[PDB]
């Protein structure tokens, strides 16, 4: 799996790759790994599938009751919180990575890590297998003040080239703009990703 | 096992061989993998046949006691749920592999679930021992909104890849068609291998074997 | 007539006739005083005797270093009481190796004494408390009642005849701070007295004295060690 | 796997005089090739006429005498007396036994006054077998004073021998050439060397150097 | 209704009466008079704190508290019971933050103790709490917040509160102020007024005058008011009267 | 909770509670079953107080399993925790025995938990009395269960309002080699001697059990029966 | 009815109130405190010749230093006689040391107002019983008093059971601190005597004397008449 | 956690007069990869009180959360009671080896910087309870690298000036970004003196590779 957020003006960008395995063996090739979270909040899943699908079940159910109690859109750092303390209460016993971005009117756009049980807001963020082999392309090509468009440019961008390196990453990128307005879903076909050396 | 779904253009397919080995010997040549949740959803076992049999048992009984306070037709979905909270809170252990099909008022739906509580939502699917021979079929003549005699066509071909490719399955290909009117249960659809035929001659005389005691007791 | 039976019966005019009837142990355990100068906390009280025979019963406990009590009502509740402060002290010291500070110690009974006030089948405990404690803030003067409210005193004297102890330490309340130990601890001594009958004066039988303070740590003073307080008293 | 366990090194001694017990120990804290410390002495007053030495892992060693620290004031609060040399001997026995599933990986030696005020030195293992001794060594260089201590405390070995019984003065000798030794051979004995004297006027606390190395 | 019908929370009285929560609001009436003022950039609060004793200490029984760093509460009625709530309603806020990583909001927390209180208005296994408090909070977000919630675990948003023996007469005179478009600082003078007047020097013995405020000149933080501004309060607060 | 029962018995030996849980029986809304040669009919009136109720949304003929079906009479928020719970029972069954569970198995499982209101601490009998029906072995059941938690197999009976009447009215109207369609219009009938108005196919309820399992019969079936009377 | 934890308008709960009521019902008991040693008498109160005078052991051995005179409920005394005894042998074991009469006599004081009905695991009833500690410790010859309210004390003389008011006022006028124990026994067995309706005998009650370098004994009945024919 | 994730490697802490200071890293390992060079491992506990923090970074955010609201709590009490910088690591000891003691430990090695009542104070905690006070302290490989400096000046002058201390520890901080392959050129500067705790950063320590042209 590659998975990716970047932080904008007004909201986020999010993409994922679409491969889901078991050992070499492709199982399903056009999975979409943004899951939401809220209207207006997501989270892109990575690691065990089982485990990844189970927090994101349990903090989509409990977002949705604090949201109904505070009268109120949960805030994306509340999201956050919620997926990472699941997460480090069951370190031990889970080993999915859920990454966490979306939109606020406290905050806007924010993007957060929650790898093991910790927390951290970044400017963009990446994680999954793939996401080994870009870390010298992100850190080369992410620039600050980047548009939506330029966001989703790099998002496609980093994680077709994760794709094409990493076995267990592959098929299509789904793309996922959360904004005041509302959110957008894109998705880039494996006849439409953008080309790199591949020799 | 080689079990499979498919998602036509008025419905869901569910194929399955008959086939239970117990370490490299045939125990039934016809078992029934396809089974019943609620009339318009069915699902297919594959892995250890007690917990694919209770598993799919249990969820069916949930599924009555759900419709029945409910008043209306199951979703899809629900079994989808109800099945995959109960085998991730047993990690794994409980090793059943299925794959739900099957139609409610948000039309035709088709899913895999793996014993670690995993699932997708998918047009074709394929799982058990066979599943890369079925896998193959499907990728390779697979195209959406395909007539019900052209989904049944590819699903019994998606089967029997599996049946004689895989020494885990055989047997015969039973088969499930699901439309907004309800189910139709295909067994035995499709007999890859022909009436098995031998010069049997085992016929023993009365008495060649040797008793040393009998008692008769009348009933 | 039917309000009286259980602390979790609220009587029409809004009150709860448990928790003034376990009241009323307090008022009938003998006089005690408390009352404290810019560096102690004294406790001052009268040891009531069963007969002539018999000793006079113990009313000053020791709590830690820093926190020392007085008790008046059920002797039993005292001991429940005592054991959960000087418990509550121990975790302190083992988990933040710092003395319990008193108001904190103080709150926790207010706390721990409340939940029995609330709850069916379950009492208010029958004993009223004078806390001595030195800490960061100085000496402290406190009072536990049966009602699990508490409160923060100059000086103070719960039991029978207290209202007589409580004038003394309302006339004298002005010398008290700048007081040095001898005069802090006859001041309390005259308070206890004036609660004892016309005919009856102190004694090294019948008074006890616990001192904490900036440099000496909780010490209970009962017959002889009494003995150089008593030697000052003059009068009435 | 984690290993609840770490070796901090230190040597504990202790000898029982006629009207006296001292209890000594180096001030260094160790673990692997480190010193994490050089003031971290093994000495622990716990009446005025009881001291312990705690020596092994110091997680434990800190517990442990918090415990011990904690139980001497519930009883206080209970007896309305101090307790005696040997209640703390016996109760210390049964919370090293409370942990004999997962023991307090600590080498305890107490030392102190009994009721005719007399010396008397108390030796445990980390489990709670415990008994009276004359005197006693514990923790890394215990090995290496033992037979010293046998030997000239104990006149182990010396025939046509004036057993003369040692005074505060030539034990005070006697431990401040030991711990040289035993700073000169034991990598986790050294930097400096504190000694605790009980006696019925009560504790005194001496600290002389050992090698910085 | 003396008649079996007013011994438990968990028996309706024929006219479909919770007796019991009826009998714990009556010993908040007896007690001594709070009051909470909401204004154009904060809460600010004030106690008739009688003083029972000249014994006492000043500052013994604090009726205001601080049931976390941007909430304040202001109690009234039997002080265990309302000491018991505040450690609740602190247990509230530090649960929110463990759980959501940012500061309760007000009327979240004003909901979530409303329903401490309600539940022990149903059983006769428990008692109600003889008790009625204040909320006051604080936050560019949300604004300046006050809440009131009483034993029968009714929660709701107040502009200007009073509860107590004075209730009435109170909100009779913070009614006349024009709170909305006030600061603070201005406000603390008003409610120092208002609790002298509310007070009975007749019937009451001495009181002590306890003033909290949270509000965008204490940077959103449950205060104390200074006893430089405190002192300025009295002085006009007796003064008035006159 | 309450650890002790709140159904006593009286000097003269009497359940008094049991006794005053008939009485809510009693005055409920009347319910009759009729076990005719090949099926089973259940029948109730279900008249609501205005026209302002849709009468399509709630139901007092209820669905247990494929084959069993049930009505009442008293009151109807404790009919729900039975029906519930039956519906559970009849799951455990079919989860063990993977059979259709018995009509005398179904009705002495729910009868136990009916008796354990009676007993059990700090809770009143339920105010309700089930008639239950239902085919296995190829013929029909008609049961009745009371708050006591007693059982009776029935051949025709009647629940409720004017129950005393309609009991007598069964025993001599009808008799053996009923066919459901004729034990269909004997239900209605029976229900007819204390409907108090028109009686229309949206205030009686009718539920048939046959070799085709339990099912509720539609508006459009009870307005034809109702076209014959 | 009401709570077992009710309490009445005068502060005290009406539960203990009734506890000591049912002291006033047992068997007359005796304790004197003396300097060399604590002696223990009570009156057996048998009611039949068939009765084995043995079998009513009213005067109990704690320890070898501690003994203990009970009047009252006997059955409910047999609870608290072994939380006493068992007290002693953990004590024993956790310190190699002995307790003092006071620490024994708190221990089981612990266990008065452990009674009650709602959130409890379980007496339903206080203990209708009163006790005298007798034994000998660090501090000497110690005699201490406790009864259902948890409230212990120590005494130099004092007198438990149906005749508590006279033979006290009795002990009264004949106690000195510096009496023998000898005269201790003495004007136990002649304050017995007075207060009982049977006559006295070897056979008819209990003595129990503890004194320092003799440990805890009981009087025999050859004992008990030596004291008699005195 | 029997199995850290994200680790910080040395803390380094040393006294002055007049106060503690306490440097560390702003990097978050995964192994050997740099995952997150930009994380602080500093955190001012209260007014007297600072910790910095090597290995697990979310059991780090855990003890960060469990000691902020604990300060929280006292403050609403507000009786004139605070927790010393050593009742903060007389708790942390307590957490550390009841959690060990548990089979379950908080994968930490932490250093506590202090200054309450005109003295410094600066204590060690391990994961296992091992808890000691010492003028210098260096964890991690730290105790290998930056310990033996910290020591050999604290041996020719044993009282620092806060300036001297602060170029002490600038020193150290290069050492270890040349010789610790954990490391990163990007840490913090946490200093505790009378007027209170004062967190710097992101501070980067000049180097020199001229040994490149040997
Ligand atoms: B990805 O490669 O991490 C992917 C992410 C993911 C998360 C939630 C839901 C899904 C699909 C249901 C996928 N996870 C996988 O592909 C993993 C295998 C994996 C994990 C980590 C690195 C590489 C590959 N798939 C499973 O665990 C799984 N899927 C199907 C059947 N059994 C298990
Ligand atoms: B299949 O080959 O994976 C098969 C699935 C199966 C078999 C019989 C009935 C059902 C109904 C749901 C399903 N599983 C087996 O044949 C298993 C062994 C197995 C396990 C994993 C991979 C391949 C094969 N066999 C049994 O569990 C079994 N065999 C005979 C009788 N009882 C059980």
Known sequence: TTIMAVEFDGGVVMGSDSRVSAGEAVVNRVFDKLSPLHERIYCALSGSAADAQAVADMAAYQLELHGIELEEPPLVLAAANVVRNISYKYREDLSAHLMVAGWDQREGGQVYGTLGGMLTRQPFAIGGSGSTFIYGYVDAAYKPGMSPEECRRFTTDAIALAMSRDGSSGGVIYLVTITAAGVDHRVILGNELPKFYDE | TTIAGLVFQDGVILGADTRATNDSVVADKSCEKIHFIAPKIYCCGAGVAADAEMTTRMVASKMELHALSTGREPRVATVTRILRQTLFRYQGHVGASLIVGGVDLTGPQLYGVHPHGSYSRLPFTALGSGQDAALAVLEDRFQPNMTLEAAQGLLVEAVTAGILGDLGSGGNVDACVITKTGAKLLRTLSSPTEPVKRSGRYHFVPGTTAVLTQTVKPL | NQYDNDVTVWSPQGRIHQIEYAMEAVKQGSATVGLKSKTHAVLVALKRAQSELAAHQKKILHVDNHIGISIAGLTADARLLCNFMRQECLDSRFVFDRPLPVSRLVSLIGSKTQIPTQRYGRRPYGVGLLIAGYDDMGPHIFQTCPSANYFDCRAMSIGARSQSARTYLERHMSEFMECNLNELVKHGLRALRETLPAEQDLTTKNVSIGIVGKDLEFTIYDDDDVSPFLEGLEER | ?213 | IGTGYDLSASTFSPDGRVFQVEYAMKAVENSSTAIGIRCKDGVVFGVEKLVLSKLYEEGSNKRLFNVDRHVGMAVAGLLADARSLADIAREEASNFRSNFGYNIPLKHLADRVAMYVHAYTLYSAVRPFGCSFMLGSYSVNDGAQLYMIDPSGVSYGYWGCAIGKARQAAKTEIEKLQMKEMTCRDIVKEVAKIIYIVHDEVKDKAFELELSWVGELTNGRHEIVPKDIREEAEKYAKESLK | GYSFSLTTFSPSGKLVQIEYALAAVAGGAPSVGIKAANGVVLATEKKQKSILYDERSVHKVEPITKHIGLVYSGMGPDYRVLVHRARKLAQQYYLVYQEPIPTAQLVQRVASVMQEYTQSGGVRPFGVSLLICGWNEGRPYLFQSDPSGAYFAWKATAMGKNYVNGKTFLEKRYNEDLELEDAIHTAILTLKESFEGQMTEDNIEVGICNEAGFRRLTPTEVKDYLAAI | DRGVNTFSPEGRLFQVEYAIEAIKLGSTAIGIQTSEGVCLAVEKRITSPLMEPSSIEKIVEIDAHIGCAMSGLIADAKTLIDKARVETQNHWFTYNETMTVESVTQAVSNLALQFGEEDADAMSRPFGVALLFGGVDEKGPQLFHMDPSGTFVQCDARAIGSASEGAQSSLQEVYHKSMTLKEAIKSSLIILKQVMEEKLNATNIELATVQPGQNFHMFTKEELEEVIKD | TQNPMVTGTSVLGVKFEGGVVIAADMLGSYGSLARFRNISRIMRVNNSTMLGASGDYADFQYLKQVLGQMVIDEELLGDGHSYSPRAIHSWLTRAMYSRRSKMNPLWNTMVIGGYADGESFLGYVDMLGVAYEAPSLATGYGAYLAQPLLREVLEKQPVLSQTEARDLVERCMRVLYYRDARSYNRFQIATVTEKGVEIEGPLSTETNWDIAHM
């Open chain 4, 1 to 213: 796997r984690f290993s609840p366990y770490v070796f901090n090194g230190g040597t504990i001694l202790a000898i029982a005089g006629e009207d006296f017990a001292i209890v000594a120990s180096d001030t260094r804290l160790s673990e692997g090739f480190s010193i994490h410390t050089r003031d971290s002495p093994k000495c622990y007053k716990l009446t005025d006429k009881t001291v312990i030495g705690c020596s092994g892992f110091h997680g434990d060693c800190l517990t442990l005498t918090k415990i011990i620290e904690a139980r001497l004031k519930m009883y206080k609060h209970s007896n309305n007396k101090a307790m005696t040399t040997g209640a703390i001997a016996a109760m210390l026995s049964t919370i090293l036994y409370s942990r004999r599933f997962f023991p307090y990986y600590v080498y305890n030696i107490i030392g102190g006054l009994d009721e005719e005020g007399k010396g008397a030195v108390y030796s445990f293992d980390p489990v709670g077998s415990y008994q009276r001794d004359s005197f006693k060594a514990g923790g890394s260089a215990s090995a290496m004073l033992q037979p010293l201590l046998d030997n000239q405390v104990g006149f182990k070995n010396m025939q046509n021998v004036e057993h003369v019984p040692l005074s505060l003065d030539r034990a005070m000798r006697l431990v401040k050439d030991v711990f040289i030794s035993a700073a000169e051979r034991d990598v986790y004995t050294g930097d400096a060397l504190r000694i605790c004297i009980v006696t019925k006027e009560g504790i005194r606390e001496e600290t002389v150097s050992l090698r910085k190395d």
